[PDB]
Design a protein around this nucleic acid. Structure first.
Lengths: 210, 156, 198
RNA sequence: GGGAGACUGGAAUUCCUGGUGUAGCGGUGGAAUGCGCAGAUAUCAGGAGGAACACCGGUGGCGAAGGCGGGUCUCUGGGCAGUAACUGACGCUGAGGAGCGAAAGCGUGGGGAGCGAACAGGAUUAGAUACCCUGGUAGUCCACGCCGUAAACGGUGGGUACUAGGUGUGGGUUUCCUUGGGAUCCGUGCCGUAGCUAACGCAUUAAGUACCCCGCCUGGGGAGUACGGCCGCAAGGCUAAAACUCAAAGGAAUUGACGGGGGCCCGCACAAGCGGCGGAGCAUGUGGAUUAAUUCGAUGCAACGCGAAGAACCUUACCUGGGUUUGACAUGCACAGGACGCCGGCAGAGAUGUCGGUUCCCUUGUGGCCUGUGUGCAGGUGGUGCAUGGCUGUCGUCAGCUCGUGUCGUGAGAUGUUGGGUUAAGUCCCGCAACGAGCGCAACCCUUGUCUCAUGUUGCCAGCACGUUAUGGUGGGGACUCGUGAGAGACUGCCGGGGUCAACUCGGAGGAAGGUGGGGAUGACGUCAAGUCAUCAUGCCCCUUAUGUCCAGGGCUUCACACAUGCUACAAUGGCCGGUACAAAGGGCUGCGAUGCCGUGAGGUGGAGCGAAUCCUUUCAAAGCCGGUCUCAGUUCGGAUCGGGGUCUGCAACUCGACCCCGUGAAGUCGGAGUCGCUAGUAAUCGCAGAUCAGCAACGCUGCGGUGAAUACGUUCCCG
RNA sequence: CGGCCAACUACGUGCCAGCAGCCGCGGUAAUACGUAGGGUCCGAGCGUUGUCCGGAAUUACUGGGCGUAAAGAGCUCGUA
């Protein structure tokens, strides 16, 4: 319908960096398999925690798993108790040893992934969806330094039978411009009536910064 | 490139052996696809067989056959109101050279000599005298044009 | 208009002066056919006013319901309208017409209550009246009866204004019962006002 | 051109007699019935007879309304102005009532040229009882009467008084310039305030403000119909219901879509070409029929070499059979444990069972490990894309889609976004109750085209040296490439003309390139309940002794058919044999595999050398060029089919693999209606590599390069 | 105990059985059908049916209309 390519996959050569970074000849399928099982292992407890980014640098078979989140304090509970448990399970599930770096984003409401987190987690929690979005925004519109936003919500909105898509915005979000620095995040709400897939575009600025 | 106006056309180099626009254009209309070199061997061999059966300059024989097949009027198929009208229209120079060479090649290709060289030689010779089927297609095209002269007024 | 009860840890709800009385009369989704389907929008007929007897009439167009209500609030905010009274009544029987909206607004003795249909009941409950007697004849609508009621309140005038138009000393313009009601209403204005000063 | 009566005028059509004169005339989108060749149509002269009145003549005159236009005469009706002489409220309206009242129709008697219902033939068409054509009676005309109906419409009853104006034109009085202007009374139009209206509109000729009298309306059908009466020669008119039934039927305006509406534009949309498909054989996919099973999905464009970038077993979802229960896989409970699990032997289609060797690592309480027995439970390629998310197609890479604030409108809404020009483009200028913004378009990015700087191995080799056999092969060298980094360069920037001195367009120069240089990547708001619960995720429903799961065999490859996309052809621009020249990109670890040797050939034996600008895919091609032969034929074309004989991959080529050798040698002679692709390195043709993959159904898909055309007059027609 | 019109959830049947004053609800997730909880309104009563007035300015004296929505006799003359 809207045949819109994932813009983090449309600027992954130009502005947005890769999330996983190594070099691999004849070891690549194994590094893919470990990358997948690591991201499944970091889905659940960190999606409780407020995860945004999961980068995996990979040096000579050590591993370096780095996570950008919005609360160092739920990811790091008691020191080593909440960190070294998921870290140690990453050390056992992989056949390797894990150096887990955990870091905070300076503003959670201007990460598109974290905006999709807070919006969809509100939308599972029986709030008004036009109020959620509309408050998804107002906040982020701001606050830093953030020249667009565009929120779309499809699915059983309000528990209705029809799957109505909604489309709210403010400012400038140019997708066809490649010097855009757009963050994109889709996260999917889980109501009892079903799943409300939320897409958030956030246009930070014109800046190439090449 | 129609509906925007006339489109610019490619300039055509002349022949190396004979030195004519019309020889090279005959080669590019001999070109059953792919083999321009083999088209050059057909056209060259056929024109030295025309040189054998005339003893003269082959391009003069070629331009005399080309003149004797070249039409002046062509019929159209324009349809005013529930009847198909054969409309006769003045033929441009390039359109007339195109119909002359294209009829020459195609009705040489229908002719029953053994190779293609003997076909094209005999068709350039018979069109030089005026005895090929292609000259009969010129006379049938002027037959349709003169038979349909009245419909030509539309000024179209 | 749902999910309004909320507590926010944000900057401000910006609650401030002019706590006026605001009534939303009707909302009908307004559709528009375009190429491939229908575009639904929203209309909110917004009545605002204070209990003195100043009335607004706003008409909100937006494709969200609280957005249309807020735009009607700002439009009636832009356009107020003064209504003259006697005590908390109306001066004299009028008929207003907004092209099909007929409304008869007749005064009554106090204690009777605002008797009117829901649009006229909205425009008169926001206003400074408490005891009048209206009726909405014709047009069976909300917009034309609100706008007809406001035209009916434009056909109002003071007893004093009438006296002024005719260059006559009051007494000589009113009859006497209505002058006594002026004495009653200004007397209770004096009682509640001087209880307001202390 | 108010009416009636009477007399008369010419042009034109038709017929008639007579000339002149020949084979067609008539008619149509195109034709045919038709009139002709016995003298038509054509033209000239004369005659008859009827009807209608060109020009003046129109947004104009008159009439109460119908209505009224050749002329003249006779009789007669109304209107307007001027003076104010007379009468002195005699006014207004008007239920019933009488009269007038287009056209069609009716009666009796005339008249009958043209036109012409009905009525024929012709044509069109599936079929025309229709339009179109040829003929044609009542009628149309007059005299005398009937009838009483119309969108008889200004859709506006008659009278009266008042309420800003502006400009036409018709009739008449007067003051001034001296026909011009003014003022006035009566008429008829166009625009316009206030006011009015649901809105459109009306607006001194009211639908405005008021008074007087009349007609008439009370939801839509039923129905202006029945019954009854009245009028009528009749057709019919007038007056006028109910049962029953519907939840509406309506008015104006708005946004869209649509039109066999208008205008302006574009696209291989048509035209101009070139090559195809549809006929033949096969390869793939689908329909249908089969079947134990032919797993499941995808059926206009946008399903059908599509999910499949690889069906012998596996895959696999299907079928017959054999097994199986905490299950093939998790994890939480209880409960016993001490090894779990392994490597075998045997019986078995195999799953599996039964025998043989190994028996735990911490700790003292258990954990690492499983089996049991249960318990929650796992598992479902079971159902629902009409409950969804995600991903995707399509309209279309088309130029559009909106919003904020202001104004306009009772409102839906409008405006902006329309107008003038311009553009590949809502591109851009100039205007305009709008002023701005946003998502698109463009630009940013990749690749291709030129040069500069950097640049030297595995890449190049000019100038040097050495090779002799084989070549950059080797010492060497940065000169040329080339490889990959940075940078310059195309901006209407420079000159000429049109432009409103604006945008932009036509030519020229420089330049490798000229005007979005070429191609990509890039899909706006939405559409289609489009696709997918079989990639995945998932709400709900269903199975839980099976709809789970394990294996062998079979099927997904069946075949009287029909479609669809491809490939090889039907030959001489060709086939076959010999000699010879030029690519680009790619691929490679339990992979790519050379020289050599054995084969006819698939290949076998062997391992040089390479994780690869090095080694291998041979130094890479094929079409090309030179030469010989074949002589137009069912052939030295064509390779399907079938027989024998092999090789390789794999546990295994029967159902069902590819390749090679020998033989065999069918259809097919350029393909009906129809239809498809393509505008320059394109079409056409020629090989090469890759992904999937042990092998291959690869003629597929994705790419790479070689050789390389024709045509575009132009928007009438088809399509969007 | 959809809306008017105070008062909502689950289970059971999934164009059936039924509901309803009008608008309209039932096509395996009904707040509209049946049963349950719960709520609301009344209370020795509470619902239904019928008949009348009201709302109905919907026969308009008070208090309506007739360009196009229903509605100006085809046009005049004239008796009461």
């Amino acid at each position: 319908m809207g045949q819109k390519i994932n813009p983090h996959g449309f600027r992954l050569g130009i502005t947005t960096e890769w999330k996983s970074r190594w070099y691999a000849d004849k070891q690549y399928k194994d590094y893919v398999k470990e990358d997948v099982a690591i991201r499944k292992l970091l889905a659940t407890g960190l999606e409780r925690a407020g995860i945004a980014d999961v980068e995996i640098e990979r040096t000579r078979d050590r591993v370096r798993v780095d996570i950008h989140t919005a609360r160092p304090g739920i990811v790091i509970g008691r020191r080593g108790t909440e960190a070294d448990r998921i870290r140690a399970d990453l050390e056992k599930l992989t056949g390797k040893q894990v150096q887990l770096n955990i870091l905070e984003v300076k503003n959670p409401e201007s990460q598109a992934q974290l905006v999709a987190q807070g919006v969809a987690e509100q939308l599972s929690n029986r709030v008004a969806f036009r109020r959620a979005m509309r408050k998804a925004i107002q906040s982020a519109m701001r606050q830093p330094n953030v020249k667009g936003i565009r929120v779309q919500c499809s699915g059983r909105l309000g528990g209705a039978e029809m799957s109505r898509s909604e489309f709210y915005r403010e400012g400038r979000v140019p997708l066809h411009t490649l010097r855009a620095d757009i963050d994109y995040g889709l996260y999917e709400a889980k109501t009892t009536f079903g799943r409300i897939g939320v897409k958030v575009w956030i246009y930070k600025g014109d800046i190439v910064g090449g | 490139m129609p509906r925007k106006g006339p489109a610019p056309k490619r300039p055509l180099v002349n022949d190396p052996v004979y030195g004519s626009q019309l020889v090279t254009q005959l080669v590019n209309k001999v070109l059953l696809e792919g083999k321009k070199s083999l088209a050059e061997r057909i056209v060259y061999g056929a024109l030295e067989q025309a040189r054998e059966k005339t003893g003269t300059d082959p391009v003069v024989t070629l331009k005399r056959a080309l003149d004797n097949v070249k039409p002046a009027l062509e019929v159209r198929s324009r349809r005013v109101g529930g009847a198909t009208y054969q409309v006769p229209v003045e033929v441009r120079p390039d359109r007339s050279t195109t119909l002359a060479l294209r009829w020459l090649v195609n009705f040489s290709r229908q002719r029953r000599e053994k190779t293609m060289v003997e076909r094209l030689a005999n068709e350039i010779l018979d069109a030089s005298n005026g005895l090929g089927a292609s000259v009969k297609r010129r006379e049938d095209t002027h037959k349709m044009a003169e038979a349909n002269r009245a419909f030509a007024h539309y000024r179209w | 208009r749902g999910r309004r009860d909320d507590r926010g840890g944000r900057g401000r709800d910006g609650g401030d002066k002019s706590n006026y009385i605001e009534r939303v009369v009707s909302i009908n989704r307004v559709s528009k056919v375009v190429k491939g389907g229908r575009r639904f929008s929203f209309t909110a007929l917004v009545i605002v006013g204070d209990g003195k007897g100043m009335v607004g009439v706003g008409y909100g167009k937006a494709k969200e319901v609280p957005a249309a209500i807020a735009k009607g609030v700002e439009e009636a905010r832009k356009n107020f309208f003064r209504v003259p009274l006697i005590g908390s009544t109306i001066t004299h029987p009028v008929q207003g017409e907004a092209a099909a909206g007929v409304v008869m607004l007749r005064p009554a003795s106090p204690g009777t209550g605002v008797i009117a249909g829901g649009a006229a009941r909205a425009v008169l409950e926001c206003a400074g009246v408490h005891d009048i007697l209206a009726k909405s004849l014709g047009s069976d609508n909300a917009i034309n009866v609100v706008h007809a009621t406001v035209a009916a309140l434009k056909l109002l005038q003071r007893p004093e204004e009438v006296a002024a138009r005719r260059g006559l000393p009051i007494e000589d313009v009113a009859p006497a019962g209505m002058l006594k009601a002026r004495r009653e209403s200004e007397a209770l204005a004096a009682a509640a006002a001087r209880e307001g000063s202390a």
